Amino acid sequence: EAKPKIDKDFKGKANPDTPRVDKDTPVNHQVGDVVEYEIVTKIPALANYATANWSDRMTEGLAFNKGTVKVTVDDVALEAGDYALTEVATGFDLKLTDAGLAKVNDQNAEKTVKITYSATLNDKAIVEVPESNDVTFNYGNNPDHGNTPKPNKPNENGDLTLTKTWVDATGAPIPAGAEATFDLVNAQAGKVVQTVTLTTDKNTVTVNGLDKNTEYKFVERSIKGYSADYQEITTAGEIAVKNWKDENPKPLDPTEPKVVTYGKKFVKVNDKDNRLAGAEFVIANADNAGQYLARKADKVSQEEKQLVVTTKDALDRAVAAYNALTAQQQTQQEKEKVDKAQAAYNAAVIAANNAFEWVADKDNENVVKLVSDAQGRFEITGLLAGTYYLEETKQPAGYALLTSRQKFEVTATSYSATGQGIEYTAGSGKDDATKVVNKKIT
């Protein structure tokens, strides 16, 4: 029996015979980039499959673009009746009907199926944390109920629990068929985190001490004659798998491409390194003149546009009140009011920054505006690597306005690296931000 072959990659790069070996190197994209993917499957001559299904799911920072799936066989588009497509927020399932199966079965030569589609890197992607998809091709001469893992976060305790059930080909409950081993995998970066095994007398296992902001997946090692149906995620910290006794070959599971966004942290200080609240900046693409970084209007929701306005107004008020205090009056508790308002603002900006463009006039509501908190902190996330320039548009109370822009470089580690000259948060032991120095004489 010749086996089918599969690969998944960016558009034009998939190759089932010779898959890329450096796929674990993420490609830098910015929030709003539409990323195009390609799944190529080779089916041997004289196949007689009862099921040929593809299941694709992705981590939460990639939004599957509904309506973008195209599927061809030997470069001929399938007809609507040839497949059933179901689309969910995190991906899709594409299942050949009998009309579609007829196009890949009983053929006198290898058939090439190509599925293309895109996803948009979204406002939930975290700087330097990659986003990935995961695909299975589930097939066999009997009907197959297998599909691809659904990544999930642990619960707030850092716990993730696997539960397995077993059914026969008809979906009727049956006793555990065999020991079942799974690799717990970091779904963002594709690294194995642990291996667990369920013995036949105990169908649950909990993994502890996981990162609550990381998505993971339990990937079942093939059990002879059983196919793995990963159930829809309903709650953090829980993953469920149903093993169907379909008596089919193990599914195909290609290696997965990765994308990642970059970022930069800053701290507003004076020449004595005192941290300063309420400095406002925009981002330009040159040291003079040039353009300013803005979110694209047609990609910010009504709710998002209003939250930026609301939170900016609360921040302006919180900064004005903090500024009316004497230095001795600027206590931990007073700084906290500013930091809370700034954090709500920063979160609204990150939510509203769904795509970027460069504009001529900095006097534009969509131009990204950064504001320093009472520890002087401000940051930008979701970016392409490159060279950028901060322009101060409003100095901290009592200082002169800066007369030059400040160049900074965004890189694969510009957000996280130490050695940058100041701690983003005082006392952290990591100097992972760049100082922006204000003066009374410019």
Author numbering: 186 to 627
From the manuscript:
All the three forms of RrgBD2–D4 possess identical tertiary structure and all exhibited root mean square deviations (rmsds) with each other on aligned carbon alpha atoms of less than 7 Å. Each RrgBD2–D4 crystal form contained one molecule in the asymmetric unit, consisting of an elongated polypeptide (84 Å in length, 50 Å in width) made of three immunoglobulin-like domains (named D2, D3 and D4). The first 262 residues (184–446) form a dual domain (D2 and D3) made of two β-sandwiches of approximately 100 residues present in all crystal forms. The C-terminal 180 residues (446–627) form a third domain (D4) that contains an additional anti-parallel α-helical motif. We also find that each of the three crystallized domains of RrgB contains intra-molecular isopeptide bonds involving: Asn 318-Lys193 for D2; Asn 428-Lys349 for D3, and Asn 623-Lys453 for D4.
Gram-positive pili differ from those of Gram-negative bacteria by the presence of covalently linked subunits containing a conserved LPXTG motif or a variant of it. In S. pneumoniae, the genes coding for the pilus are contained in a 12 Kb pathogenicity island (the rlrA islet), consisting of seven genes of which rrgA, rrgB, and rrgC encode LPXTG-containing proteins. Only RrgB is strictly necessary for the pilus formation while the other two are ancillary proteins. Here the crystal structure of the RrgBD2–D4 backbone subunit fitted into the EM reconstruction of the S. pneumoniae pilus reveals for the first time the polymeric architecture of a Gram-positive pilus indicating a head-to-tail organization of individual backbone subunits.
